[PDB]
Swiss-Prot record, chains A, B, C:
The protein, known as: Aspartate carbamoyltransferase catalytic subunit
Amino acids binding L-aspartate: 156, 218
UniProt feature coiled coil, ranges: none
Gene for this chain: pyrB
SUPFAM superfamilies: Aspartate/ornithine carbamoyltransferase
GO CC terms in record: aspartate carbamoyltransferase complex; cytoplasm; cytosol
Length: 281, 281, 281
C-alpha cells in the first residue's frame, strides 16, 4: 500500500495502479464487508460547505468500517485544522474555497486529510466512484467509448475523469457541448500528446449506437426516446443532482445507472478510508 | 413477524395483534436490553422538518440496538430517497408535507421507510408510545376509561389513538372540547358501527372520578387542584410540548406521567426498528 | 471514586484530591486507551449555544470510550431536560444563560449533567485541561511560576484556574493586565487569606525569565521576539481561539503549547466521563 497515511487532495496526483488498487479494495469491500476494519478509529467529517449527500455517503462509508464520526455539516482555518488534528485519526473535509484542503495538510500533522470538495475544483472521490462504476458495469477500464455530454468547461470532475481514463489504453471519447461550454484545450492536448481518440459533436444520436458510457454533467436534455440504438451494455451516468438534464422517463430504462453510480460512492470512499488508515489488506 | 422489512407510514394500516406484538417487543427490550441486535446496521435519520425530541428519541432507540446513524436535522425528494436508499438499511424520516413518506416508499426499493412525522398527519410512533404507556400503567388495553381533553379536531394522533383503542374491547371514551374543536364525526361513526361507548363533556371534574387515562392535547387548563377525586391508578398523558395546558403544579403528583410517556418512546421505536430489520426475536 | 454519578457544574465545587484523581485518570487514559469502558452508554451532547471545538472534543472523548452520542449543535428548558433525562445515561450541555446547568440538575433525575459552558460563567473542563497540561508539561502542580496575561477580569476560566492552582502549595503568580481589566479583588483576597505570592505587572519581559507557565486570555500582543530569556521548560497556553493575541511566529517555537493544550481536552473530558459513569477504575 503506497497510500498509508497519505493526504488525498487531487486524484490527478495518483498513478494508474493506485487507481486499480483502490478499485480492487472497493470491490473486495463490496463483496464481503469488513465492518471492524477501522474499529477504534475516530474521523472528522468537517463540511464547512454543506453537502449532505456527499457527507451522508462519506459518513456511511466510515460507519460501514466500524469507525466513529464527529464533525459538523455547517479564528483561521489553520488553527481549526491544528486543533482538530489532535482529536481524530483522519480529517474528511469539504470547504467552499479552492486549495483549502492542501492548506489544511500543512497543519494536520500525522493526520491525513481527505478532500470531499475543495471549492468547485478537486473532488477526487466523485471521480473514484465514476471510475469504479465504469469498471463495475463494463468489467474493464480499457477499450471503451465514453460520450461526455453537457457543460464540459467548468465542472473539473469531468477533466479528472478524462485524465483518469487516459491512464488506461484503448478508449475513444465523444464530447457533446454547445460551444461556450467545451472541454478545455489542455485535456485535448493531454490526449494528443498521448495518442488517444476523441471527437466533438452536436447531438447525442450522432454516435448513440457506439457509446459504452454516457456521462452527463450539470438545451441538451436527454430522454428515453433517444436510447433506441443504444448498446445493451450502455450505462447512463450523472454525478447528481439532476433536474431535467435527464428526464424522469429514463429512470425506468436498463441504461439508467446514476443512482447505482451514487451508491458506489459508499465503496469508493470506504476503500479510500481503508487504504489510508490501514496497512494490511 | 409480519413486519419484517415493512414500510410504516400509518398506524391505522395495522392489525390489533400487530400492535400487541410491537408492545410485547417493547416490553421485552425494556426488561433486558439487546444492544447488539441491530449491529452492523446503518439507519438514516432524515428530519427534513426539524423535530429534535422525536429525532433524539429515534436515534437513541437506534443506538440502544447497536446500530449506527447518519442523517440530517434540517433536486426532488424522489431522487433524494433514490440515492439514500443505496446507503442505508432503513430510512427514518420526518417531512413537513403530507404523504411524503408514502412517496418515499416508491423509490426506497428494498429499504423500509419509517414515518417520524408526515406533515401534521401520520405520526405512528407517537401513538405507539401512547398505547405502550397505557398498557404499561394499567396492565391492559381492554376495559378502560379514556378522557381526551383539548383540541381533538386537528391533531390526528388523537384519532389514531382512538382507532387503536377501539381495536380492543370494553373501553369508554370521554371527549372534552370547546365546540369548534371536537372529535370529527368519522371517529364517532367508527365507534358507533363498532358498538363502543363515548360521551362529550364540558369540563374535566364532570367525570374526573371515573377515568383511567387523561390524555391532553396541544381555556381548558389543567391543575393539580382538579385531581382530588382521581382514581389511584389514573395517569395524565401529554404528547408534548406543553405550556400551561398542564400547569407545573401537576408535575409533583403521582398521576403525572407525560415524561415517562415520552421516555417510553425509546422502547416503542426500539421495538419497531427491531421488528422491521430483524426476523428472529 | 467520589464522583460516581455526580453533577459537574462548577470546578470550584471540587477538592484538590478530586483534581488529582481526575488528572491521574486522564493520564492513564492517555497512556493506554480503554475504548470499551463506557460501552452500551448513550450520552447527550446538548449544545444549546454552538461551540464546535468544545463539542467536537467532548464527542471525541465520548467515542474514545466506546459510547454513543445523540444531541444537537443548535417549551421550557425544564421540560427539555425532564424528557432528555429519560433517554440517555448522561447529559453534556452548553447553554448561553448562566446557571442553566444547575437548573438542569433539578430535572435530570438519576442522570448526571456535565457543564460544557454555562453562560460565560463556569466551564470546568477547560480549567481541567489547563491543569492537566500544566501537570503534563512541568510534572508537578506545586512550586511553579504562573504568568497570566490579558483580560483577567471577565473570563472566569482564569479565576477557576487560579483557584485550582491555589489548592496546591508553593506557586507564585504574575498578573499582566491594562487596568480596567485586572484580576478581581476576591481572588487576590483568596490568595492573601491563604498565603500565596502574586504580583501585578505592566509588560511581559518584566519577569519573562522567571515564569514556568505563560497563560494568555482573549495591545498586549505576544511575539516570538519576546521569548529570548524564556526558561527551557516554559510553555505558552491559550484556551483558544486566538487571533494576534499570539502572533503566528510563536507557533514554530518550543514554548508554543496551546494546540497540545486543546488536544489534552480529549483526555480531561474522557477522564471526567469515565469517573462519572463508572465505579471501578
Amino acid at each position: 500500500n503506497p497510500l498509508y497515511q497519505k493526504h488525498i487532495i487531487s486524484i490527478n496526483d495518483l498513478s494508474r495502479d493506485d487507481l486499480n488498487l483502490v478499485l480492487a479494495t472497493a470491490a473486495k469491500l463490496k463483496a464481503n464487508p469488513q465492518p471492524e476494519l477501522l474499529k477504534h478509529k475516530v474521523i472528522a467529517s468537517c463540511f464547512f460547505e454543506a453537502s449532505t449527500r456527499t457527507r451522508l455517503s462519506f459518513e456511511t462509508s466510515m460507519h460501514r468500517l466500524g469507525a466513529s464520526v464527529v464533525g459538523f455539516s455547517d479564528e483561521t482555518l489553520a488553527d481549526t485544522i491544528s486543533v482538530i488534528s489532535t482529536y481524530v485519526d483522519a480529517i474528511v473535509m469539504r470547504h467552499p474555497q479552492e486549495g483549502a484542503a492542501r492548506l489544511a495538510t500543512e497543519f494536520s500533522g500525522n493526520v491525513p486529510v481527505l478532500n470531499a470538495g475543495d471549492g468547485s475544483n478537486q473532488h477526487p472521490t466523485q471521480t473514484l466512484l465514476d471510475l469504479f462504476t465504469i469498471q463495475e458495469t463494463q468489467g474493464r477500464l480499457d477499450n471503451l467509448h465514453v460520450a461526455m455530454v453537457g457543460d464540459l468547461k467548468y465542472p473539473r470532475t469531468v477533466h479528472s475523469l478524462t485524465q483518469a481514463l487516459a491512464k488506461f489504453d484503448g478508449n475513444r471519447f465523444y464530447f457533446i457541448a454547445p460551444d461556450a461550454l467545451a472541454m478545455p484545450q489542455y485535456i485535448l492536448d493531454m490526449l494528443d500528446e498521448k495518442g488517444i481518440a476523441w471527437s466533438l459533436h452536436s447531438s447525442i444520436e450522432e454516435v448513440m449506437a457506439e457509446v459504452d458510457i454516457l456521462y452527463m454533467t450539470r438545451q441538451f436534455v436527454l430522454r428515453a426516446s433517444d436510447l433506441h440504438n443504444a448498446k445493451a451494455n450502455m450505462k447512463v451516468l450523472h454525478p447528481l443532482p439532476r433536474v431535467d438534464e435527464i428526464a424522469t422517463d429514463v429512470d425506468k430504462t436498463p441504461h439508467a445507472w446514476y443512482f447505482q453510480q451514487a451508491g458506489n460512492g459508499i465503496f469508493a470512499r470506504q476503500a479510500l478510508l481503508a487504504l489510508v488508515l490501514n496497512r494490511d489488506l
